[PDB]
């Protein structure tokens, strides 16, 4: 590897970086180094070139592509190394940036006018309840609305009038309404409980007129008259001139505001709100010290009076203005040019040369990567990102362990920690034992990286470790919940960090089908927000349903419409890149996405069908599923075994179902040597982690290394009874599976856990589908709702899987890929597709995906909750002693193959099952006994 490093630096920051860059490369003179070094040498040079201080101006070239660029060095657009760069390059009708500046400046000088009431003064001094009857943002909004109703609010002297209690402060003037919504929602968004309003309201002001004081601001309301008697000590020199210059800025630019569309207004006001909380939290974090008394805004850690309200308003204004400037004029730090990506894929990765069919100069890209598992999907996503140049992306993945797997792939192929940042925000205690030096695994949290210039506008220089890893990451391999808060939050400033993260970075969401329906709705909201700033969305899901692919394209198309009309460019359409392991297709799609997507789906189906059938599923006829499991285990051991040894996966639905199947199979008298494992999610930290590592090392069938992790000498049935934790994110390979039916994507995923690593075709049948789910004996009205898309609004007419599924069927992604809306009441696949198009629809609703008008409100974050689960309290095992109503028990010790013990950790119990003892056990975790 031959590199060349050039320095642009002034100071002796052309000198103390010269020591480190002259420790690793030869000096060719004139502050230019050039030579041969290894990739780990590149990583070491990066780590000790960035850590040496601020102001390092370093460009590296590997062959002729730029390896890395330290700082905001413009470096190369076409040629490299410019001459002098001075000022005044373009200076356009910027319009919408002047609009955002005027809105943020006018609102930020009015965002805390409502702290001047006597209640907030005695709240800061501390002789009343610290919770206000009406929040000060609403009081400042009442001030601004009363001033606007009285005088002309855009060109007049200010003077705060006598204000009363107003239920609504939103009128008709679109720009005033924007300023009012920025003022009122500078801490939290208003929440609308009204069902008719949630049913009908769509527009900007027409929804904003329904935002009343009862949506969170009106806490208790007994001291309203003191909350609206206000002093007017803000009339000073610099506050009045700042208010005048920003109001006239808005006055001069609001003529382009009425030429915007609804989508524009929503996205622009979201940006304005994010910059306003950025400036407000930035000025509230630091201590300024000086004060002019008689009025105060915030308190220090000692509770003393600080940050008087005139200079508080001025500081929040300038900090929000500077926030806006750096978030709207940033050339963000991108990743290194990974040299182990750009070469050809060989063999089964040979489809990854589809990036040589995509244009490298497209400003936008919507990848739908429909490639099957085991083909290197995430490597192909990184290849697609690097085809357009240097990489800046957020790999948002479900589960901690899947982020760990993608991080380990990124580490061992070409990516160091100067470009990658693995973020899992829980600090799990799963450590690697055996040998620390001989590990060559366990990707960790260090991020030598490079701190971006956006950290100076965040509160108190961003944060410590976690938010520095969030914001400053070129490549952010993260759990997805660090990105879905970009679309907005209930309370606080947790929106700004993923918002500013997704503003300048691409978004790569892998296996989006494993998320929930509301989770997929907020993920497509994130896709729309990412496309709002021209970034590229890579979706990587093999079993995509047309509905999902369509609504994600429509979210990207609305976002790219926002980005196109935001830079005053005519919208040519979205560069959609359909991708699988058989080919690629790049089309400029502005309309008719459905026929092209279904034609690619049909081409992928015909490229999947002439291949040999790997998963032949038979739906059993035996009604009782206990003895159906027995007979199917006996049949698939007598048919599918490797010299007497067979691996079976009993995929069931819930935990007590799993322990019921386990306790039946343990007490089942047979000549077969059944060896039973329980693989559900309710387990203690230690025990769970141990199951994972063992299962990953015994079900690895790409080699014969497993022969030494199990007793393959004696003919044995190694059976793993598992819940849907096996069908998501597990690289497992079973000889056969017996599936309790809950949803068709569960069938396709548990087919993907059988012969995942081998290529031998089954002869007779490798999957035995149960006749009924076990909830049929508990609830015959609805049985597929647990881990399925059946529900109270979408009920199957019959629950028989002979009626709702094929008796003999080759299970692949084809049934999920096709998409059928008719006959959803008597087939599982059409039931699935129905729900997917009836929840992820092209409407705005309130919990929908095109959400417009409601982004202003708190409604999409309350009624569409990301990871909406049950109450979930956590019973914690502390050194062998349980906390709550747990009561350790003893398992049946009949056929347990492996049982790992646990002493620490915690189990997640729903509040429903907290009533009784969860009865934790070493073999199977939680049950009802």
């Amino acid at each position: 590897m031959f590199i060349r490093i050039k320095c642009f630096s002034k100071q002796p920051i052309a000198k103390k970086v010269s020591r480190e860059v002259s420790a690793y490369l030869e000096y060719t003179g004139n502050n230019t180094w050039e030579g041969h070094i290894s990739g780990q040498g590149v990583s070491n040079l990066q780590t000790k070139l960035i850590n040496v201080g601020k102001g390092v101006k370093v460009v590296c070239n590997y062959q002729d592509k730029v390896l890395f660029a330290i700082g905001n060095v413009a470096m190369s657009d076409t040629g490299s190394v410019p001459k002098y760069t001075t000022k005044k390059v373009y200076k356009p009708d910027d319009s919408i940036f002047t609009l955002k500046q005027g809105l943020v400046g006018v609102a930020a000088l009015w965002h805390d006018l409502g702290k001047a009431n006597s209640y907030f003064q005695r709240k800061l001094r501390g002789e009343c309840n610290p919770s206000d009857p009406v929040r000060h943002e609403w009081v400042s909004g009442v001030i601004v609305s009363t001033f606007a109703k009285g005088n002309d609010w855009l060109s007049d002297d200010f003077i705060i009038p006598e204000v009363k209690h107003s239920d609504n402060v939103f009128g008709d003037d679109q720009v005033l309404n924007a300023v009012l919504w920025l003022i009122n929602t500078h801490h939290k968004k208003g929440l609308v409980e009204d069902p008719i309003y949630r049913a009908t309201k769509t527009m900007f002001t027409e929804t904003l007129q329904c935002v009343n004081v009862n949506g969170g601001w009106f806490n208790y309301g007994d001291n309203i008259d003191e909350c609206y008697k206000i002093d007017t000590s803000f009339i000073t020199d610099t506050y009045v001139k700042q208010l005048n210059r920003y109001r006239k800025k808005l006055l001069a630019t609001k003529h382009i505001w009425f030429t915007l569309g609804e989508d524009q207004k929503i996205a622009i006001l979201q940006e304005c709100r994010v910059a306003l909380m950025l400036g407000d939290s930035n000025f509230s974090s630091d201590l300024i010290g000086g004060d002019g008394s008689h009025l105060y805004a915030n308190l220090d850690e000692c509770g003393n009076l600080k940050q008087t309200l005139t200079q508080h308003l001025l500081g929040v204004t300038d900090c929000a203005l500077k926030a806006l400037f750096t978030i709207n004029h940033h050339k963000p730090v991108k990743a290194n040019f990974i040299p182990t990506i750009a070469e050809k894929g060989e063999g089964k990765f040979a489809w990854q040369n589809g990036v040589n069919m995509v244009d490298s100069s497209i400003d936008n890209m919507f990848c739908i990567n429909m490639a099957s598992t085991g083909k290197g999907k995430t490597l192909a996503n990184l290849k697609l990102l690097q085809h357009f140049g240097n990489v800046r992306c957020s790999f948002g993945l479900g589960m901690v362990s899947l982020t760990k797997q993608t991080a380990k792939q990124f580490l061992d192929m070409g990516v160091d920690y100067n470009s990658a940042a693995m973020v899992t925000g829980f600090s799990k205690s799963r450590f690697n034992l055996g040998s620390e030096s001989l590990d060559q695994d366990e990707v960790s949290v260090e991020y030598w990286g490079q701190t971006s210039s956006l950290s100076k506008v965040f509160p108190n220089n961003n944060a410590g470790f976690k938010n520095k890893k969030l914001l400053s990451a070129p490549i952010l391999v993260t759990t997805t919940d660090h990105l879905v808060k970009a679309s907005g939050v209930k309370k606080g400033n947790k929106q700004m960090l993923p918002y500013v993260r997704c503003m300048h970075s691409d978004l790569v969401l892998d296996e989006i089908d494993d998320y929930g329906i509301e989770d997929m709705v907020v993920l497509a909201r994130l896709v729309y927000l990412t496309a709002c700033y021209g970034n590229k969305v890579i979706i990587s899901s093999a079993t995509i349903t047309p509905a999902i692919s369509n609504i994600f394209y429509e979210a990207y198309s609305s976002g790219y419409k926002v980005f196109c009309a935001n830079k005053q460019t005519t919208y040519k359409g979205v560069n959609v890149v359909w991708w699988d392991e058989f080919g690629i297709k790049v089309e400029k799609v502005t309309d008719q996405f459905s026929n092209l997507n279904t034609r690619f789906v049909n081409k992928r189906i015909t490229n999947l069908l002439e291949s040999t059938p790997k998963h032949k599923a038979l739906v059993v006829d035996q009604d009782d599923n206990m003895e159906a499991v027995k007979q199917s285990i006996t049949t698939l051991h007598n048919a599918h075994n490797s010299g007497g040894v067979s691996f079976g996966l009993i995929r069931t639905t819930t935990i007590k179902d799993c322990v019921a199947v386990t306790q039946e199979l343990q007490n089942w008298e047979t000549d077969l040597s059944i060896k039973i494992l329980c693989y559900h999610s309710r387990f203690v930290g230690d025990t769970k982690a141990q199951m994972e590592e063992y299962l990953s090392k015994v079900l690895n069938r790409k080699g014969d290394e497993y022969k030494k992790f199990v007793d393959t000498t004696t003919p044995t049935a190694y059976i793993v009874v598992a819940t849907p934790v096996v069908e998501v994110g597990r690289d497992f390979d079973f000889d056969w599976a017996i599936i309790e039916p809950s949803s068709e994507r569960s069938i396709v995923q548990c087919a993907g856990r059988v012969l995942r690593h081998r290529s031998s075709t089954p002869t007779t049948h490798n999957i035995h589908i149960l006749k009924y789910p076990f909830k049929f004996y508990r609830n015959s009205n609805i049985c597929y709702d647990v881990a399925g898309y059946e529900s109270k609004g979408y009920k199957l007419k019959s629950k028989n899987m002979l009626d709702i599924y094929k008796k003999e069927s080759i299970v692949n992604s084809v049934n999920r890929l096709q998409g059928d809306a008719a006959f959803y009441t008597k087939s599982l696949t059409a039931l699935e597709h129905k729900v997917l198009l009836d929840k992820l629809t092209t409407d705005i609703a309130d919990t929908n995906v095109f959400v417009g008008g409601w982004q202003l409100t708190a409604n999409p974050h309350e009624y569409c909750k990301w990871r909406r689960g049950t109450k979930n309290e956590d019973l914690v095992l502390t050194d062998g002693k349980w906390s709550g109503n747990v009561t350790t028990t003893k398992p049946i010790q009949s056929k347990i193959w492996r049982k790992w013990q646990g002493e620490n950790g915690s189990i997640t119990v729903p509040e429903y099952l907290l009533d009784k003892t969860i009865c934790y056990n070493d073999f199977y975790g939680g049950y009802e006994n």
Binding site: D77, T85, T86, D359, S360, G389
Partner: protein
């Protein structure tokens, strides 16, 4: 004032994209829309090109023309199949050598002489293939390429009309483009309005070969307005004969290799510089028009 650098040994080669081209403090440079000013070596530049969002000034154009740098503008194509119109500023203030234009005129006006020159220039692409052999892509001396160029030479030998030359031209272009497609295992259709990298690399090489051809013609004073091959499809001037002498020998395998390896456009620019410089393709074209003119 010295020898002013002869055109065939001029080496630098650019197509400038999204930058206003100006002069700072003596030298011609281009300033992009981020503040970056990159200098152009105008004394050694063969041609510059101007893509979308480009803007050159007067004294910059003067310093290119008086030094003898042919300047064109890449956009202008508006049809569905053809690279329609490329606008090209000739440095005519340098008074050109004359008798090569007289020889080109005496072969252009005589119809049987134009046909004879049409013949030799059609086999000139055949010998271009034989001389300029790349290390990658196809091998020229395989059975399929030799069979098709043998059928092409046999058909162009017995040709008697320019429409027969246009038909045989079409079969030659279809034969090569598709054989390269087969080698690189892709499906190929030549559309100038396509997002596929094998196509816009071919249009970038069309612009590169256009610039090379006007520098070769201007170095001998030959105008583009004397097309020895003409037709309804083939209406671009003499640049659409001295530019596509070197498609299937130089540009099209280089475009397919660049679209197969798949980095950005700048490696293709630099690869065109490297192959036009190492094998001296400009001097090769000039010397071929030299042995055309005096025969």
């Amino acid at each position: 004032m010295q020898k002013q650098i002869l055109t065939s040994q001029k080496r630098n080669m650019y197509i400038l994209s999204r930058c206003k081209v100006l002069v700072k403090n003596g030298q011609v440079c281009h300033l992009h829309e981020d503040g970056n000013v990159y200098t152009v070596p105008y004394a050694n530049t063969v041609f510059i090109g101007l893509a979308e969002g480009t803007s050159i000034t007067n004294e910059a154009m003067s310093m290119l023309a008086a030094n003898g740098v042919i300047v064109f503008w890449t956009k202008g194509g508006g049809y569905d199949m053809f690279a329609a119109d490329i606008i090209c500023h000739l440095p005519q203030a340098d008074y050109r050598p004359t008798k090569y234009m007289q020889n080109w005129v005496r072969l252009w006006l005589d119809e049987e002489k134009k046909l004879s020159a049409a013949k030799e220039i059609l086999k000139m692409r055949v010998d271009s293939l034989s001389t300029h052999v790349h290390d990658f892509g196809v091998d020229v001396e395989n059975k399929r390429v030799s069979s098709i160029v043998n059928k092409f030479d046999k058909g162009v030998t017995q040709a008697t009309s320019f429409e027969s030359l246009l038909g045989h031209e079409g079969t030659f272009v279809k034969s090569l483009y598709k054989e390269y497609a087969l080698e690189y295992e892709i499906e190929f259709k030549r559309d100038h309005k396509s997002a596929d990298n094998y196509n816009k690399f071919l249009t970038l090489g069309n612009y590169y070969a256009y610039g090379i051809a006007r520098s070769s013609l201007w170095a001998l004073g030959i105008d583009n307005s004397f097309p020895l091959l003409h037709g309804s499809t083939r209406r671009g001037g003499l640049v659409f004969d001295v530019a596509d002498i070197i498609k299937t020998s130089i540009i099209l395998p280089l475009a397919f290799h660049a679209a197969d390896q798949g980095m950005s456009n700048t490696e293709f620019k630099r690869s065109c510089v490297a192959y036009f410089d190492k094998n001296d393709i400009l001097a090769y074209l000039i010397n071929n028009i030299k042995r055309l003119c005096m025969e």
